[PDB]
Amino acid sequence: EVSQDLFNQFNLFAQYSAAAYCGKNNDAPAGTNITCTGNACPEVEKADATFLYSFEDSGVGDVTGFLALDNTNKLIVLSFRGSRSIENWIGNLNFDLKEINDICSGCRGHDGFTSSWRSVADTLRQKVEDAVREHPDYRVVFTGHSLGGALATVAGADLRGNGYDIDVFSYGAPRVGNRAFAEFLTVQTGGTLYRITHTNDIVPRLPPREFGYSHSSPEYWIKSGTLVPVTRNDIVKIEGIDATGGNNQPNIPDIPAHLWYFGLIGTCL
Amino acid sequence: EVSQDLFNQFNLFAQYSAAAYCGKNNDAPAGTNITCTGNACPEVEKADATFLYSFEDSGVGDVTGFLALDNTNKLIVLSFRGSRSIENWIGNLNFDLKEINDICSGCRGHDGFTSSWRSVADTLRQKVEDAVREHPDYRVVFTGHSLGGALATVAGADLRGNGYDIDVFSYGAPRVGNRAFAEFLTVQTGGTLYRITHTNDIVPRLPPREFGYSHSSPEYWIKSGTLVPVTRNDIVKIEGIDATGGNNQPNIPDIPAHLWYFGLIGTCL
Numbered sequence: 085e086v087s088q089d090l091f092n093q094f095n096l097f098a099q100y101s102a103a104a105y106c107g108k109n110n111d112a113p114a115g116t117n118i119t120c121t122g123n124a125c126p127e128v129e130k131a132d133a134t135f136l137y138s139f140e141d142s143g144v145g146d147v148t149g150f151l152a153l154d155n156t157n158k159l160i161v162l163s164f165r166g167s168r169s170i171e172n173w174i175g176n177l178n179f180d181l182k183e184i185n186d187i188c189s190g191c192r193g194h195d196g197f198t199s200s201w202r203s204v205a206d207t208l209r210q211k212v213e214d215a216v217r218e219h220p221d222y223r224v225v226f227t228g229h230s231l232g233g234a235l236a237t238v239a240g241a242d243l244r245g246n247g248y249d250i251d252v253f254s255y256g257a258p259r260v261g262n263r264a265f266a267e268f269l270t271v272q273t274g275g276t277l278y279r280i281t282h283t284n285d286i287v288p289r290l291p292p293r294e295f296g297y298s299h300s301s302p303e304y305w306i307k308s309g310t311l312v313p314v315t316r317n318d319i320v321k322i323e324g325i326d327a328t329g330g331n332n333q334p335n336i337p338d339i340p341a342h343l344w345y346f347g348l349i350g351t352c353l
Numbered sequence: 354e355v356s357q358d359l360f361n362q363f364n365l366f367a368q369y370s371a372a373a374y375c376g377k378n379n380d381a382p383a384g385t386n387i388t389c390t391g392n393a394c395p396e397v398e399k400a401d402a403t404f405l406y407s408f409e410d411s412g413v414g415d416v417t418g419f420l421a422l423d424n425t426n427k428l429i430v431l432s433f434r435g436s437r438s439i440e441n442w443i444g445n446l447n448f449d450l451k452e453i454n455d456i457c458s459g460c461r462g463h464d465g466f467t468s469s470w471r472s473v474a475d476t477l478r479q480k481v482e483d484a485v486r487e488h489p490d491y492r493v494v495f496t497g498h499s500l501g502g503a504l505a506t507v508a509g510a511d512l513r514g515n516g517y518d519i520d521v522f523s524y525g526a527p528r529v530g531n532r533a534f535a536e537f538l539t540v541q542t543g544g545t546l547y548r549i550t551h552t553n554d555i556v557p558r559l560p561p562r563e564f565g566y567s568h569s570s571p572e573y574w575i576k577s578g579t580l581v582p583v584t585r586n587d588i589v590k591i592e593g594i595d596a597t598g599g600n601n602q603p604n605i606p607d608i609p610a611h612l613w614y615f616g617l618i619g620t621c622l
């Protein structure tokens with residue numbers, strides 16, 4: 085069980101994460117209203133929310149996403165898109181670690197996530213910094229679904245502690261690195277990570293523990309079914325690095341559960 | 354705005370209509386349980402419901418669907434799939450009428466749906482007749498989404514009057530013929546047709562009335578949004594051939610609205 089305000093926040097950033105796929109966007113001028121097809125992001129459309137900067141297939145990892153300004157909620161939101169086809173992305177997912185002492189000593193992260201981020205970090209940091217300067221009062225939020233969720237988690241860990249808090253809301257994110265990287269994520273000040281999972285979603289169960297991955301704590305776990313609407317009672321806060329009894333349970337996982345966080349996500353009607 | 358009992362039927366056959374796309378049965382032998390992927394048909398799975406005959410790309414229209422036995426609800430269900438890529442099917446959709454006197458006098462129907470039905474009619478009639486014999490007190494229901502709705506409607510008009518009632522539940526069905534056919538489907542005895550539409554779904558708006566097409570009355574119009582759950586209070590019975598102020602409004606239409614009838618339909622998570 086979670087509060088009404090936190091629920092609202094979860095719902096909202098699920099929608100900012102969905103909008104990265106379903107935005108009628110990119111090649112889209114900054115200052116343009118954010119809108120989505122197929123009722124993917126109505127809470128974003130109600131807000132006075134506009135693109136600050138769009139990126140598409142940027143750097144080494146072909147990164148895609150947007151930076152947004154939201155005058156109603158007082159946010160600067162960096163939203164990273166997951167893969168265009170999650171099924172093949174999961175299939176070709178490689179489990180190699182690389183060191184990232186730059187982020188925390190002793191830390192190793194998934195190699196493709198950290199290198200995709202690393203390769204666009206300098207541009208996007210500057211874009212965020214610019215927006216922070218313009219709106220010092222506004223709250224900085226990074227978010228994403230799936231691989232997008234990963235990238236937002238990495239960028240957060242990397243960019244925190246430079247003066248402004250960075251909250252992270254992740255939906256169906258994979259593990260992003262080794263224990264230690266997990267531990268850092270569980271305690272790092274300068275922002276909070278809300279790591280949201282749904283039922284038996286496959287993606288947060290990869291990379292597997294066996295390959296040297298852990299999940300940060302806590303975990304926000306939606307227990308309502310696929311295509312079922314979520315209420316506050318359906319969300320369970322689960323404490324403990326690599327805790328079991330939320331998404332991390334011993335049963336057959338599901339791709340469709342990956343695509344239903346509050347609403348349709350990771351696909352566009 | 355509709356009865357609970359009617360809302361429950363509408364929901365059940367939306368799910369049988371969704372199963373024609375989802376829940377693997379590709380060669381599933383007769384008598385196996387009906388199930389779907391992606392929580393597309395839970396009310397069906399909850400019933401004691403089994404396949405009688407599966408068909409696929411059958412006849413000239415590459416018609417696909419199944420016939421089921423439902424012992425819990427006491428039904429014999431013939432469910433037609435719509436198109437495997439609806440956006441395309443929408444783009445390739447010819448508006449030509451053809452005479453269909455055999456069904457009714459002065460009646461013209463859409464050439465492709467009519468022909469497609471006619472090519473499978475004998476084999477499917479025989480399979481329904483068999484089940485009707487083994488279960489004389491079960492209700493015969495034909496149902497379908499999109500193209501599947503057109504077909505079910507045509508098949509119903511074509512096989513009624515043989516001694517067993519056939520009810521038809523269509524979802525997001527296009528127009529199937531001319532005003533004289535609309536009339537025949539409005540008043541025909543030996544069953545009821547329940548023609549359900551959602552919001553500004555585009556498909557029930559095609560073929561255009563400006564190509565000689567008309568809609569049978571009544572229409573059951575779902576006013577709740579895309580990705581929004583439906584209650585009995587969100588459905589409005591609209592009376593009159595080519596009535597306006599349900600789905601048939603001059604506003605701009607939408608494809609995602611076509612894929613949300615009670616739940617997700619015409620696509621599988």
Ligand SMILES: *[C@@H]1O[C@H](CO)[C@@H](O)[C@H](O)[C@H]1NC(C)=O
Nearest residue numbers: 116117118129130131132133
């Ligand atoms: C963008 O949204 C703003 C505030 O929410 C609204 O006043 C404006 O009409 C919208 N702009 C366009 C171009 O639709």
Ligand SMILES: *[C@@H]1O[C@H](CO)[C@@H](O)[C@H](O)[C@H]1NC(C)=O
Nearest residue numbers: 385386387398399400401402
């Ligand atoms: C088929 O469903 C029936 C009841 O609806 C159930 O008794 C039976 O076990 C199911 N068969 C399988 C293989 O699950």
Ligand SMILES: CCCCCCCCCCCC(=O)O
Nearest residue numbers: 416417434435437438441442
């Ligand atoms: C009654 C079942 C009819 C379903 C089969 C139609 C074939 C769908 C293939 C996709 C081509 C198209 O876009 O129309």
Ligand SMILES: O=Cc1ccc([N+](=O)[O-])cc1
Nearest residue numbers: 089090092093096157159
């Ligand atoms: O509607 C609510 C609401 C609550 C909190 C937040 N937020 O902190 O961004 C946004 C929306």
